[PDB]
Amino acid sequence: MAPVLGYWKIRGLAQPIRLLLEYVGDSYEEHSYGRCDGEKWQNDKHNLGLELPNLPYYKDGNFSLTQSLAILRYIADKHNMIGNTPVERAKISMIEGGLVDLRAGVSRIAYQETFEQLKVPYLQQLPSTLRMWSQFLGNNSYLHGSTPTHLDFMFYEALDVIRYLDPTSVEAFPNLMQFIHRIEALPNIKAFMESDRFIKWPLNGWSAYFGGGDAPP
Amino acid sequence: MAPVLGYWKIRGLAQPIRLLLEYVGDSYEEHSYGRCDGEKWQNDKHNLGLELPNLPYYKDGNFSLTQSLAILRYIADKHNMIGNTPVERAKISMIEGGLVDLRAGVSRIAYQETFEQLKVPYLQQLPSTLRMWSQFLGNNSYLHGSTPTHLDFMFYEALDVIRYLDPTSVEAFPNLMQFIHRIEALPNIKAFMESDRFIKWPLNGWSAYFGGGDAPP
Ligand SMILES: N[C@@H](CCC(=O)N[C@@H](CS)C(=O)NCC(=O)O)C(=O)O
Ligand SMILES: N[C@@H](CCC(=O)N[C@@H](CS)C(=O)NCC(=O)O)C(=O)O
Numbered sequence A, B: 001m002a003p004v005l006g007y008w009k010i011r012g013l014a015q016p017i018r019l020l021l022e023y024v025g026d027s028y029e030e031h032s033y034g035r036c037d038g039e040k041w042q043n044d045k046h047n048l049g050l051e052l053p054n055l056p057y058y059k060d061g062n063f064s065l066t067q068s069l070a071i072l073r074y075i076a077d078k079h080n081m082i083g084n085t086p087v088e089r090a091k092i093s094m095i096e097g098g099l100v101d102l103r104a105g106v107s108r109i110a111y112q113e114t115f116e117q118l119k120v121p122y123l124q125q126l127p128s129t130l131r132m133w134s135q136f137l138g139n140n141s142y143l144h145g146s147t148p149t150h151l152d153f154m155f156y157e158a159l160d161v162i163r164y165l166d167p168t169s170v171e172a173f174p175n176l177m178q179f180i181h182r183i184e185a186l187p188n189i190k191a192f193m194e195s196d197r198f199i200k201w202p203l204n205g206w207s208a209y210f211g212g213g214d215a216p217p
C-alpha cells in the first residue's frame, strides 16, 4: 500500500503534486473522486481521520495531511526543495504564494457564468502579471536553483492553464514558452503525460464555465 | 531603520503579521498606505526592488519578501515556530492553509454587492467549519505546541472577523471564545491593542460591502 493522494478527477490544485511525485519517481496511489462520487467523498471526509478534512488529502499509514501547498511542501521537503536558511526558505514560500495567486486568478473567474465578460479585464491585467514572472525567471531554466522543484510544477500548471485560456498572452514572453516545453521534456514528466494516469481535462472542477465539463469544448 | 512592513491601512492580510511582530516584541516600522495613498504605493513599488511586487511586503536591509504567509513564516521561522521535523513542518503548513481559507471565506463574499444574499449560505455552512476548528483546538490553549505561534494570530484574527460578521456563530463554541480572550490577554498583545498603532477598522479593503468603509456601520 503506497501513500495515497485523494482528489477530484480533475487537474485543479492536485496537478502540481502529481507532477512532482512523477518527477521525483516516488510511489503513490491516487484515490480519485469522479463527478458523481460526491457521497463517497462525504463518507471519507467523515471517516478517514483527517484533522482538517478537505480535498486534496495525502495519507501514508497513520500520517495524513490536507491543503495542497502543505502536501506539495511535504514532498518537496523530503527532497530538499524548501531551502536551507531562513532567508531561502522564505524566498521559496514567497514564490509559492505568488504561484498560488497566479493559478487562482483563473479559478476566481472560471466558475462564474459571466466568465466571458470577467475575461476582458482579466486579460488587460495579465500582461503585467506574466511580465513579472517572465522577469523573475529571466534566463534561468527553473524558478529557484538549477534543478526542477515543486515551484516549477506549480508554475508549469498555471502557465499551461493560462496558455489554454489565451495563448497569445503567454507567447509574448519567449522564456515562459520555453519553460513550458522544458518541463514537458523532463523524461519522467513526458512518460507520465503519455501514460493513462494523466488527467488532461478538466482544468478546473467540472462545473466551471472555463476549463470545466468532461472534455475540451 | 528597523524592518519595514508595508500594507494598506487595513487589517486584511497583514493583521496577523502585526500581532505576531508585536507578540515577539521585535522592532519594526510600518509604512501604511491609506485609501487614497495608491499613487504613493505605485511609486514605492517602483523603487523597493521587490522580486514579486505586492502588498504586504516586508523589507529589512537588502532582504525583501512579499506574500503574507511567506512574511509570517519568515518571522515565525526566526523564532522556531515552523516546526522541527518533516511531519511537524508539514502539519504546520496544513494548519496555515486551513486558516488562510478560514479568513478568505469572509473576503470572497465581502466585496460583492450581493454580499447580503451570499451571507445566507455562508452562515449555513459556518457552524460545521467552526466545529472542525473547535475540535482541532480541543482542550489546547494553542493550535500547535504549548506556546503561541503565527498560527494563533492567524486564527485569532479570522475568528474576530467572523465574530463581527455573526457573533452568535462563534459564541456556540466555548473553547474558541476562551481562545480569543487568551490571545487578547497576552501582555504584548493587550498593550498593542491599547496603542494608537492598532488598526481596528476596516476588516477588509475600504471598498468592501462587509467590513469595509470608514468606520463600523
Ligand atoms: N486551500 C485548499 C483548498 C481546498 C479546497 O477548497 N478543496 C475543494 C476542491 S478544490 C473541495 O472539494 N474541498 C473539499 C470539501 O469541500 O469538502 C487547498 O489548497 O487544498
Ligand atoms: N496572496 C497574496 C495577496 C496579496 C494581494 O492581493 N495584495 C493586495 C492587497 S490585499 C494588493 O493591494 N496588492 C498590491 C498590488 O497588487 O500592487 C498575499 O497573501 O500577500
Ligand SMILES: [Zn+2]
Pocket: A024, A025, A026, A079
Ligand atoms: Zn523521492
Ligand SMILES: [Zn+2]
Pocket: B024, B025, B026, B079
Ligand atoms: Zn524576536
